[PDB]
Design an enzyme around this catalytic site. Sequence first.
Site, PDB file in Angstrom:
ATOM      1  N   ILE A  99       0.830  -1.202   0.000  1.00 23.59           N
ATOM      2  CA  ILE A  99       0.000   0.000   0.000  1.00 23.59           C
ATOM      3  C   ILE A  99       0.870   1.259   0.000  1.00 23.59           C
ATOM      4  O   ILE A  99       0.561   2.227  -0.710  1.00 23.59           O
ATOM      5  CB  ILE A  99      -0.984  -0.010   1.195  1.00 23.59           C
ATOM      6  CG1 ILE A  99      -1.874  -1.246   1.103  1.00 23.59           C
ATOM      7  CG2 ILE A  99      -1.853   1.260   1.220  1.00 23.59           C
ATOM      8  CD1 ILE A  99      -2.338  -1.757   2.484  1.00 23.59           C
ATOM      9  N   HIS A 100       1.951   1.246   0.778  1.00 16.58           N
ATOM     10  CA  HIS A 100       2.890   2.366   0.802  1.00 16.58           C
ATOM     11  C   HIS A 100       3.456   2.668  -0.596  1.00 16.58           C
ATOM     12  O   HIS A 100       3.473   3.814  -1.023  1.00 16.58           O
ATOM     13  CB  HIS A 100       4.017   2.085   1.767  1.00 16.58           C
ATOM     14  CG  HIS A 100       5.119   3.098   1.718  1.00 16.58           C
ATOM     15  ND1 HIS A 100       5.055   4.299   2.393  1.00 16.58           N
ATOM     16  CD2 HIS A 100       6.314   3.085   1.079  1.00 16.58           C
ATOM     17  CE1 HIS A 100       6.172   4.975   2.187  1.00 16.58           C
ATOM     18  NE2 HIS A 100       6.941   4.275   1.372  1.00 16.58           N
ATOM     19  N   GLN A 101       3.885   1.623  -1.302  1.00 17.60           N
ATOM     20  CA  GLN A 101       4.452   1.770  -2.653  1.00 17.60           C
ATOM     21  C   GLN A 101       3.479   2.447  -3.607  1.00 17.60           C
ATOM     22  O   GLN A 101       3.894   3.213  -4.464  1.00 17.60           O
ATOM     23  CB  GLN A 101       4.925   0.416  -3.214  1.00 17.60           C
ATOM     24  CG  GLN A 101       6.123  -0.196  -2.487  1.00 17.60           C
ATOM     25  CD  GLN A 101       7.425   0.569  -2.689  1.00 17.60           C
ATOM     26  OE1 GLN A 101       7.890   1.271  -1.797  1.00 17.60           O
ATOM     27  NE2 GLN A 101       8.024   0.426  -3.869  1.00 17.60           N
ATOM     28  N   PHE A 140       2.837   6.367  -1.791  1.00 17.21           N
ATOM     29  CA  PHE A 140       4.051   7.177  -1.738  1.00 17.21           C
ATOM     30  C   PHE A 140       4.413   7.712  -3.127  1.00 17.21           C
ATOM     31  O   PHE A 140       4.917   8.837  -3.275  1.00 17.21           O
ATOM     32  CB  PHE A 140       5.231   6.359  -1.246  1.00 17.21           C
ATOM     33  CG  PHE A 140       6.507   7.147  -1.160  1.00 17.21           C
ATOM     34  CD1 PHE A 140       6.757   7.952  -0.053  1.00 17.21           C
ATOM     35  CD2 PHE A 140       7.456   7.100  -2.190  1.00 17.21           C
ATOM     36  CE1 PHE A 140       7.934   8.714   0.034  1.00 17.21           C
ATOM     37  CE2 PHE A 140       8.639   7.859  -2.109  1.00 17.21           C
ATOM     38  CZ  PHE A 140       8.871   8.660  -0.991  1.00 17.21           C
TER      39      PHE A 140
END
Lengths: 242, 242, 242
Positions: free
Chosen positions: C224-226, C229
């Site tokens: 989810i971060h990838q 971000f």
Amino acid sequence: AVVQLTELGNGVVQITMKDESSRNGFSPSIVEGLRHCFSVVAQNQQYKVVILTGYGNYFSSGASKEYLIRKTRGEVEVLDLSGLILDCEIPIIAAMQGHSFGGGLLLGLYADFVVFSQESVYATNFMKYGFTPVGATSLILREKLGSELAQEMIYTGENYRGKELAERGIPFPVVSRQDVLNYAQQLGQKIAKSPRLSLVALKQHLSADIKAKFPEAIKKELEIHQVTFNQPEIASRIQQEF
Amino acid sequence: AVVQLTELGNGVVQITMKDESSRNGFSPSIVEGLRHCFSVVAQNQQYKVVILTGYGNYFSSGASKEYLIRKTRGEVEVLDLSGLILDCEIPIIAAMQGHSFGGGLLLGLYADFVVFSQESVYATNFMKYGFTPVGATSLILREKLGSELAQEMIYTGENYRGKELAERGIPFPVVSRQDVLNYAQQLGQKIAKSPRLSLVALKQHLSADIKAKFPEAIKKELEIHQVTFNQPEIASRIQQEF
Amino acid sequence: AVVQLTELGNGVVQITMKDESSRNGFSPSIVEGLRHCFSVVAQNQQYKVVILTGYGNYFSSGASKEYLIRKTRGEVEVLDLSGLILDCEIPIIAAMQGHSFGGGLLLGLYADFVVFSQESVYATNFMKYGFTPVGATSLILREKLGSELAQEMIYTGENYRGKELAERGIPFPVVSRQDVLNYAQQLGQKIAKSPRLSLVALKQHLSADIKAKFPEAIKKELEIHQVTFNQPEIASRIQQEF
């Protein structure tokens, strides 16, 4: 005789532990009286709530240091009283009007509702002697008290007054010792307003998560206890706690 | 007309429940208005936060006693409004400026953030009438309020003022009724500073544990409710609550 | 040199982070010093407790904004320091005498016990920049702080003084900065009274639930971060935080 069942009205009953010689420890007569009183409850289909309480300055002392010494020499079984509380079909209120230690604290925390005394002392004792808990302590303590209080209480084995536990925000009532049983009795009549069938159904439903994890938690803790309890220095640590 | 959607700016919207005849109960017009307003949200890809609120002294009254009587005679379905809150892609703040009862309390507790009014009354009503909850009450209440407050609120069915709940340390803000919506609106603008994509992704991630348990919890509670609700004495218990 | 290990007696050791140029951020020398000091602990079978602490006004600053900018251009790896804390066999006390940000806060919250400074600032920073957490933030924060505080801290990314966190009832000690390390040291000697074997066994047992969920939580958050971000507006949001 050391454990008596009395009817309070509206299907609320009281199980009172009074073995003054052992200070409500898990003596043979205490274990026999508990098993008897709870089997009486099991046969009766009219009862709705049980209030479990001790005498004087004691709710339950759990296993004596004498018992633990016998255990270092393999002379005695591990006691597992969880079934008595956990297999009871109706809600139990633990009115802990006095001190509760080790398995004695667990005995109360297995109950659906718990009332603490402000002035009394409460401990998961195991690590005071240098060894790990039995009875699914980690599971029940983390569930009822929250992980951080549970963790500190488990690592240290140290003694906490009721009032100290309130100050660190436990979700249970912490009242004066003379108020503990009365409070439990009032809560008991409150709950007993409901149909018994709904009370039995609700208890099973609310308990299902813990009930599902319990056999494994019990087995795992025992595996670890058997290792940590049976290390050479343990007998001497117990001796220094007399 | 009884449920209106208004834009507050920066992608923050408000869904306001106002059905004064039913006191924001789950009336046909309330259920229709909620489904409509939430489907409007679903089509719009510009919205970031919803604030769900009621009118006057009421957030949501849930199912009326009249409805429950119709239910004892099998004339009406079980209402499940959880989907509306749970399937909303963006964070919802329940600004509960007034009383919330039964499914009305659950309606708010399904939301990602909840604000209570100090002066208002809050209850999981079911056991007041002698029967068990619906709507995954056990799951959501234990998750949001902690197991001990949840357990007491569920067993008793009794009414709790916002201020009583704060005093027993619930993690939600409990402010004066005139402050509830303003507070929610401020929190709403705070959250809405983030990219919508991150808000949607984060909500899904944080909700996954509960979301995974929900269908089973809903089904299990319903199985038990259908048994406990349909016992002979229940209709008369409902009657005594008018 | 920026991370030093010192013996405090009774098997209690201290790992002190002091990199004043980066403010105890995850600089190359901080990461190298942490890995070195923790591997030293791993080889030693005499140690019982580690106290992890920073210097001056800083526990740990986590990833610098400069690092984050390099990351928007794919010039740097995602740092995962969880292993160092999580794979340590003995209990760790995070004495957070100063500010902790993002991965810096997580670094402390992975520990078995945590002590906060009243005057210091604490944040899960990620959403301040518009993106989602890494390092199993959701898992650890919800477990240690409760879901509602965790949720607010995660959604907002905002800064909280130690004293603000106590006021909202976190289970950790929140004391004055000059008291933080002393307190940790006292707790450390308390725990170190136990046999090392029992301490190692107990830690493994108490950590098992989180340990079992961790690899999946880490992977899921990273997925989810990838996505969040690497959205176009993120570089500029980071720039506005300088």
